Amino acid sequence: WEETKECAFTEFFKLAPLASNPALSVCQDASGWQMLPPAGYPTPEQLKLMCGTAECFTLIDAIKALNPNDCILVFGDVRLNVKKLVTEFEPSCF
Ligand code: NI
């Protein structure tokens, strides 16, 4: 994956449909991990809760559906590659 190159700022606007996705607040509330605003990669306890929550799978797939680019999303001191995150999530649960 791309580990250095930053996303264009428009990458944030690509995330807009998640605000109309009911899986968003279910996953965030259940796990404590936030996509909006981005908290970055899940912490270990977060990931454990996400992997046991159906709606988190739904959300991650929803994010996949947005065609995230292979770049680093920067939000203050938060840095993550969303494309990497969503692609590696399911195996990360196993
Ligand atoms: Ni790489």
Q: What experiment produced this structure?
A: X-ray
The structural domains of the chain, ordered by start, are: 1-94 (1.10.239.10)
| 32 alpha carbon – ligand 1 mean position (Å) | 27
Residue 12: which residues within 8 A CB-CB, separation 6 or more?
Answer: 73
| 45 alpha carbon – ligand 1 mean position (Å) | 25
Residue 44: which residues within 8 A CB-CB, separation 6 or more?
Answer: none
5 within 8 A of 72, measured Cβ to Cβ: yes
Residue of 80, 15, 22 whose CA lies nearest to 56: 22
Resolution of the entry in angstroms:
1.7
Question: b/e for 6-39, b at 16 or more Cβ within 10 A?
Answer: ebeeebeebbeebeebebbebbbebbebbbeebb
| 79 alpha carbon – ligand 1 mean position (Å) | 15
In angstroms, rounded to a whole number, what is the distance separating the alpha carbons of residues 19 and 35? 10
Residue of 24, 73, 31 whose CA lies nearest to 51: 31
Q: How far is CA 81 from CA 11, 13, 54, 77, in A?
A: 11, 15, 22, 13
| 4 alpha carbon – ligand 1 mean position (Å) | 9
Q: At what angle do helices 44-51 and 82-92 cross, to 10 degrees?
A: 60
| 86 alpha carbon – ligand 1 mean position (Å) | 14
Q: What is the 3-state secondary structure (H, E, C) of the chain?
A: CCCCCECCCCHHHHCHHHHHCHHHHHHHHHHCCCCCCCCCCCCHHHHHHHHCCHHHHHHHHHHHHCCCCCCEEEECCEEEEHHHHHHHHHHHCC
Residue of 43, 22, 24, 48 whose CA lies nearest to 35: 24
In angstroms, rounded to a whole number, what is the distance separating the alpha carbons of residues 79 and 71? 10
